[PDB]
């Protein structure tokens, strides 16, 4: 089970391209219930890891480990 606070911290350790890749993976897998905010006008995303399913969280964690 992914530690969500370590995930959130580790996500900020990615470079710009890899963090965009996180945004890509999340928007491609998102449903309304995962409470992802995407202000399309402002080009900003707000990810609530606590609303993501465990498989996506695991994919994000492995992605962080692979790219740091």
């Amino acid at each position: 089970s992914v530690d969500l606070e370590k995930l959130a911290f580790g996500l900020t350790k990615l470079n710009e391209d890899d963090l965009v890749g996180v945004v890509q993976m999340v928007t491609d897998n998102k449903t309304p219930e995962m409470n992802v905010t995407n202000n399309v006008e402002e080009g900003e995303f707000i990810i609530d890891l606590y609303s993501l399913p465990e498989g996506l969280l695991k994919s994000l964690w492995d992605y962080v480990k692979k790219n740091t």
Binding site: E5, F9, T12, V22, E42, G43, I47
Partner: peptide
């Protein structure tokens, strides 16, 4: 109860 929200601002 603490929650870390991750805000990501993209290039426009």
């Amino acid at each position: 109860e603490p929650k870390l929200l991750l805000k990501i601002n993209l290039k426009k």
